Amino acid sequence: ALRFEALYPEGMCPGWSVVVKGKTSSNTSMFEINFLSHPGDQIAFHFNPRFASSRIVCNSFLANHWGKEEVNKTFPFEAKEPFQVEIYSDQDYFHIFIDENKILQYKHRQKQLSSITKLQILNDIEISSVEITKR
Amino acid sequence: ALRFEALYPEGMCPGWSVVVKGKTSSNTSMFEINFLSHPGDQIAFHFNPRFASSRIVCNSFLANHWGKEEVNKTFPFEAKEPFQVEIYSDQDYFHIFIDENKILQYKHRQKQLSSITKLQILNDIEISSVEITKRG
Numbered sequence: 001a002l003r004f005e006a007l008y009p010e011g012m013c014p015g016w017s018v019v020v021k022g023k024t025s026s027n028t029s030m031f032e033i034n035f036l037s038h039p040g041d042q043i044a045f046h047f048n049p050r051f052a053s054s055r056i057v058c059n060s061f062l063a064n065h066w067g068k069e070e071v072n073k074t075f076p077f078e079a080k081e082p083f084q085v086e087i088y089s090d091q092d093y094f095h096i097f098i099d100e101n102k103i104l105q106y107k108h109r110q111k112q113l114s115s116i117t118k119l120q121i122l123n124d125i126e127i128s129s130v131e132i133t134k135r
Numbered sequence: 136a137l138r139f140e141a142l143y144p145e146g147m148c149p150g151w152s153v154v155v156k157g158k159t160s161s162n163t164s165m166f167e168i169n170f171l172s173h174p175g176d177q178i179a180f181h182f183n184p185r186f187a188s189s190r191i192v193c194n195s196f197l198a199n200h201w202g203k204e205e206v207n208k209t210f211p212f213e214a215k216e217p218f219q220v221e222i223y224s225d226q227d228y229f230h231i232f233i234d235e236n237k238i239l240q241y242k243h244r245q246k247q248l249s250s251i252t253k254l255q256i257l258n259d260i261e262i263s264s265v266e267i268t269k270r271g
């Protein structure tokens with residue numbers, strides 16, 4: 001279910017950095033980190049580490065359907081072991097860092113950056129910290 | 136207006152540290168940091184620096200009534216100047232540190248800490264950062 005949500009109406013894109021620390025409960029579940037645009041909560045960016053299969057699916061949900069999946073096969077995560085994820089964004093991409101190592105970048109599909117006012121965290125993650133900072 | 140809101144349904148009290156950084160605009164404005172419990176969006180802790188008077192007003196909005204006001208003498212903020220507020224909870228108090236200096240403690244009036252799941256930031260504060268961390 002939902003583990004955390006934040007709302008910043010002045011827009012957390014571009015230029016804001018989101019740092020999430022925690023660990024998973026099980027070895028075979030999953031969690032996701034979504035950036036939602038206002039109003040109507042389309043998903044500007046969806047970040048979904050899958051531990052049962054050890055891949056990272058990244059996608060967007062605009063206007064009623066997912067787009068093309070962007071997948072990363074090397075899993076920097078490890079079940080029940082603390083991790084750090086940093087998601088940042090500039091004019092052109094979302095930038096991803098795990099345990100301080102850059103893992104991927106994801107080019108904007110939702111072009112209305114200022115509409116991205118929400119953050120939510122779902123399912124199998126025990127949260128120890130969420131930090132949101134302007135860069 | 137609402138500047139920022141966060142929700143942690145597992146309950147962010149006690150043993151969590153909230154750190155807010157930003158600055159205000161006017162020498163005569165105010166902002167508030169509220170901790171809200173469910174049901175009813177009750178305000179277990181309301182932290183309200185008023186710059187027009189240079190006092191910090193804390194209170195609770197429980198069962199749809201403001202309580203007794205706990206007013207703080209010292210006023211560490213300076214309008215237009217960046218500041219840091221940290222609010223930490225233990226089993227007994229909300230502890231307030233401004234710019235790393237401890238300033239006041241506030242006795243829990245909402246006794247069901249587990250039900251405190253929402254943080255709210257309102258009005259004249261330009262936020263540069265918000266950090267929510269378990270036990271410091």
Ligand SMILES: OC[C@H]1O[C@@H](O[C@H]2[C@H](O)[C@@H](O)[C@@H](O)O[C@@H]2CO)[C@H](O)[C@@H](O)[C@H]1O
Nearest residue numbers: 046048057058059060066067068069070
């Ligand atoms: O693209 C992210 C979403 O994927 C959905 O599952 C996909 C799956 O990745 C794919 O292999 C195939 O099975 O189609 C499924 C549905 O499109 C998830 O269900 C969804 O939660 C997102 O993660």
Ligand SMILES: OC[C@H]1O[C@@H](O[C@H]2[C@H](O)[C@@H](O)[C@@H](O)O[C@@H]2CO)[C@H](O)[C@@H](O)[C@H]1O
Nearest residue numbers: 181183192193194195201202203204205
């Ligand atoms: O106690 C916190 C609330 O105070 C309200 O204003 C008070 C004010 O402090 C006092 O001087 C008196 O006049 O009663 C007012 C209404 O209770 C604020 O309006 C409210 O936002 C809280 O800050």
